[PDB]
Amino acid sequence: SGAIYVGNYRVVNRHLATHNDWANLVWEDSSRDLLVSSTTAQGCDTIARCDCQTGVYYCSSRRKHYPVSFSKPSLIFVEASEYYPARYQSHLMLAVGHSEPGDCGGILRCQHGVVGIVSTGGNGLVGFADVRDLLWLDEE
Ligand SMILES: Cn1nc(C(=O)NCCc2cocn2)c2ccccc21
Numbered sequence: 001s002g003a004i005y006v007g008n009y010r011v012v013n014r015h016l017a018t019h020n021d022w023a024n025l026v027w028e029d030s031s032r033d034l035l036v037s038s039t040t041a042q043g044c045d046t047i048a049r050c051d052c053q054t055g056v057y058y059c060s061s062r063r064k065h066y067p068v069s070f071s072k073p074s075l076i077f078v079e080a081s082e083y084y085p086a087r088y089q090s091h092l093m094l095a096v097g098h099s100e101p102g103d104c105g106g107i108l109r110c111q112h113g114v115v116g117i118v119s120t121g122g123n124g125l126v127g128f129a130d131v132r133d134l135l136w137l138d139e140e
C-alpha cells in the first residue's frame with residue numbers, strides 16, 4: 001500500500017484504488033497502473049522534475065529504505081498477476097531490489113522529490129510507475 005499527496009491530488013496504484021478514488025477520479029491509465037483522485041486536504045509531497053536514475057525506495061516487506069539505480073521509463077512486457085493479464089506496461093522503471101505484491105505504493109525518491117511508486121517485481125527486480133512526466137500534478 002501507499003499514495004503520493006501533492007496539492008489536492010492523491011496518486012495510487014490503479015489496482016489498489018478504492019470505491020472513493022473512482023467516484024473522485026481525475027485521471028487513470030491501465031497500461032501505467034496509475035490512478036489520480038481529488039482530495040479535500042492539501043498534500044505535502046513534491047514531484048521530482050529531472051531525469052535522475054539514482055534514488056531510494058521504501059520496501060514494506062523489509063521495513064527498510066534501499067538506495068538503487070533504475071532505468072529510464074519505457075514500455076516493458078510484464079507477466080500476469082491477480083489484477084492484470086500478461087501485458088506491456090508503459091512508463092515503467094526497473095531496479096535490482098527485493099519486492100513482493102504488498103510492496104506496491106512504496107515511494108521512489110531522488111534529490112528533486114518523488115519519482116514514482118512500486119508497481120511490478122520478482123526475480124530480484126522491482127518496477128516503479130514514473131509520475132515525473134505528469135506536469136499538471138504541480139498545479140490546479
Ligand atoms: C512489486 N510487485 N508487484 C507485484 C504485483 O503483483 N503487482 C500487481 C500489479 C501489476 C502490474 O503489472 C501486473 N500486475 C509483484 C509480484 C511479485 C513480486 C513483486 C511484485
Ligand SMILES: [Zn+2]
Pocket residue numbers: 048049050051052110111112113
Ligand atoms: Zn531527481
